[PDB]
Amino acid sequence: MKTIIINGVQFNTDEDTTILKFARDNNIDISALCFLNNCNNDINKCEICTVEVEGTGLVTACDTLIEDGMIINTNSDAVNEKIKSRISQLLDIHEFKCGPCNRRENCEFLKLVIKYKARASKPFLPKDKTEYVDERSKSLTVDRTKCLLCGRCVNACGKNTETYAMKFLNKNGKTIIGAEDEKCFDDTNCLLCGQCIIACPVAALSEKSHMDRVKNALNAPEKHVIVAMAPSVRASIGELFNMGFGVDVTGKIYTALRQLGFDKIFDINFGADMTIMEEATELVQRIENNGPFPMFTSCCPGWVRQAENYYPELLNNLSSAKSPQQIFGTASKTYYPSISGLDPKNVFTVTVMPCTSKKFEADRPQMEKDGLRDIDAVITTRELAKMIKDAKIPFAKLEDSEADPAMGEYSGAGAIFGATGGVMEAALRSAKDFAENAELEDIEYKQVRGLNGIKEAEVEINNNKYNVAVINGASNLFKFMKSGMINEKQYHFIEVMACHGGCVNGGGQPHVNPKDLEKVDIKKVRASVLYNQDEHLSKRKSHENTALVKMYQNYFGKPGEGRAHEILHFKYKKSAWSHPQ
Ligand code: SF4
Ligand code: SF4
Ligand code: SF4
Ligand code: SF4
Ligand code: FES
Ligand SMILES: [Mg+2]
Ligand SMILES: [Mg+2]
Ligand SMILES: [Mg+2]
State which of 155, 179, 208 marks the end of a domain: 208
Distance 150 CA to ligand 1 centre (A): 14
Ligand with smallest separation from the Cα of 221: 7
* Sheet-wide strand order for 140-143: 133-134, 140-143, 205-207
Residue 562 sits in the same domain as residue 456? yes
Residue 329 sits in the same domain as residue 455? yes
Could you tell me which residues come within 8 angstroms of residue 517 by beta carbon, excluding any fewer than 6 positions away?
Answer: none
Residue 301 sits in the same domain as residue 157? no
* CB of residue 110 inside a 6 A radius of ligand 1: yes
| Cβ 252 vs Cβ 395: under 8 Å | yes
Ligand 2 site-directed mutation target among 136, 137, 138, 195, most atoms within 8 Å of CB: 195
Could you tell me which residues come within 8 angstroms of residue 487 by beta carbon, excluding any fewer than 6 positions away?
Answer: none
Strands 465-472 and 493-497: parallel
* Sheet-wide strand order for 57-60: 9-13, 2-6, 71-73, 50-53, 57-60
Rounded to whole angstroms, how far apart are CA atoms 66 and 18? 6
Pick from 301, 284, 293: which is nearest to 494 by CA?
Answer: 293
Instruction: Provide the 10 A C-beta neighbour count for residue 237.
Output: 27
The values of phi and psi at residue 241, to 5°, are: -120, 25
Annotated binding residues, written as ranges, equal 34, 46, 49, 62, 94, 98, 101, 107, 147, 150, 153, 157, 190, 193, 196, 200, 300, 355, 499, 503
* CB of residue 468 inside a 6 A radius of ligand 3: no
The values of phi and psi at residue 77, to 5°, are: -60, -40
Measure the CA angle with vertex 224, ends 223 and 225; round to 5°: 105
| Residue 365 belongs to domain spanning | 209-581
Query: By three-state DSSP, how is residue 294 classified?
Result: coil
Residue 557 sits in the same domain as residue 502? yes
Check whether the bond before 294 is cis (ω within 30° of 0).
Answer: yes
* CB of residue 454 inside a 6 A radius of ligand 1: no
Distances (CA, A) of 59 to 50, 80, 115, 320, 549: 5, 13, 20, 55, 65
Q: What is the resolution of this structure in A?
A: 1.3
Burial of 281 (0-12, 13-18, 19+ CB in 10 A): buried
- For the chain, how many structural domains are there in total? 3
* CB of residue 112 inside a 6 A radius of ligand 5: no
DSSP 544: G
Rounded to whole angstroms, how far apart are CA atoms 498 and 503? 8
Distances (CA, A) of 96 to 85, 146, 540: 16, 8, 50
Rounded to whole angstroms, how far apart are CA atoms 195 and 161? 9
Rounded to whole angstroms, how far apart are CA atoms 518 and 521? 7
Instruction: Provide the 10 A C-beta neighbour count for residue 229.
Output: 26
Rounded to whole angstroms, how far apart are CA atoms 84 and 48? 8
Residue 488 sits in the same domain as residue 518? yes
Rounded to whole angstroms, how far apart are CA atoms 342 and 272? 24
Method for structure elucidation: X-ray
Annotated binding residues for [4Fe-4S] cluster, written as ranges, equal 94, 98, 101, 107, 147, 150, 153, 157, 190, 193, 196, 200, 300, 355, 499, 503
Q: Locate all alpha helices (DSSP H) within 137-210, ordered by sequence.
A: 152-161, 195-199
Pick from 62, 50, 68: which is nearest to 21 by CA?
Answer: 62
Q: Which atom of ligand 3 is nearest to the CA of 199?
A: 3
Dihedral of alpha carbons 424, 430, 431, 433, sign: positive
Strands 224-229 and 264-267: parallel
The values of phi and psi at residue 449, to 5°, are: -90, 165
Burial of 213 (0-12, 13-18, 19+ CB in 10 A): middle
Query: By three-state DSSP, how is residue 360 classified?
Result: helix
Rounded to whole angstroms, how far apart are CA atoms 91 and 121? 8
Diameter over CA atoms, the chain: 81
Distance 194 CA to ligand 2 centre (A): 5
Pick from 494, 480, 478, 437: which is nearest to 461 by CA?
Answer: 437
Q: Which atom of ligand 1 is nearest to the CA of 113?
A: 3
Element (H, E) at 466: strand 465-472
Residue 144 sits in the same domain as residue 27? no
Residue 314 sits in the same domain as residue 222? yes
| Cβ 265 vs Cβ 253: under 8 Å | no
Q: With the CA atoms of 194, 403, 390 and 329 taken in that order, what torsion angle do they form, in degrees rounded to the nearest 10?
A: 50
Residue 385 sits in the same domain as residue 397? yes
End-to-end CA, the chain: 58
Measure the CA angle with vertex 20, ends 17 and 23; round to 5°: 90
Strands 377-380 and 493-497: unpaired
Element (H, E) at 78: helix 77-91
| Cβ 430 vs Cβ 277: under 8 Å | yes
State which of 68, 99, 124 marks the end of a domain: 124
CA 126 remoteness from chain centre = 32
Rounded to whole angstroms, how far apart are CA atoms 272 and 429? 13
DSSP 477: H
Rounded to whole angstroms, how far apart are CA atoms 219 and 558? 38
Query: By three-state DSSP, how is residue 7 classified?
Result: coil
Instruction: Provide the 10 A C-beta neighbour count for residue 10.
Output: 8
Specify the length of the chain in residues: 581
Residue 455 sits in the same domain as residue 471? yes
* CB of residue 140 inside a 6 A radius of ligand 3: no
* CB of residue 153 inside a 6 A radius of ligand 3: yes
Residue 117 sits in the same domain as residue 213? no
Rounded to whole angstroms, how far apart are CA atoms 63 and 346? 57
Rounded to whole angstroms, how far apart are CA atoms 366 and 374? 9
Ligand 3 site-directed mutation target among 96, 177, 195, 206, most atoms within 8 Å of CB: 177
| Cβ 489 vs Cβ 467: under 8 Å | yes
Residue 58 sits in the same domain as residue 133? no
The identity of residue 488, as a single letter, is: E
Residue 38 sits in the same domain as residue 139? no
Rounded to whole angstroms, how far apart are CA atoms 490 and 77? 63
Pick from 240, 252, 250: which is nearest to 380 by CA?
Answer: 240
Strands 2-6 and 71-73: parallel
Q: Which atom of ligand 3 is nearest to the CA of 142?
A: 1
The values of phi and psi at residue 500, to 5°, are: -60, 130
Distances (CA, A) of 10 to 3, 16, 259, 266, 384: 7, 16, 58, 60, 49
Rounded to whole angstroms, how far apart are CA atoms 497 and 278? 19
Pick from 501, 491, 571, 552: which is nearest to 529 by CA?
Answer: 501
Dihedral of alpha carbons 548, 418, 403, 565, sign: negative
State which of 68, 90, 124 marks the end of a domain: 124
CA 110 remoteness from chain centre = 24
CA 299 remoteness from chain centre = 13
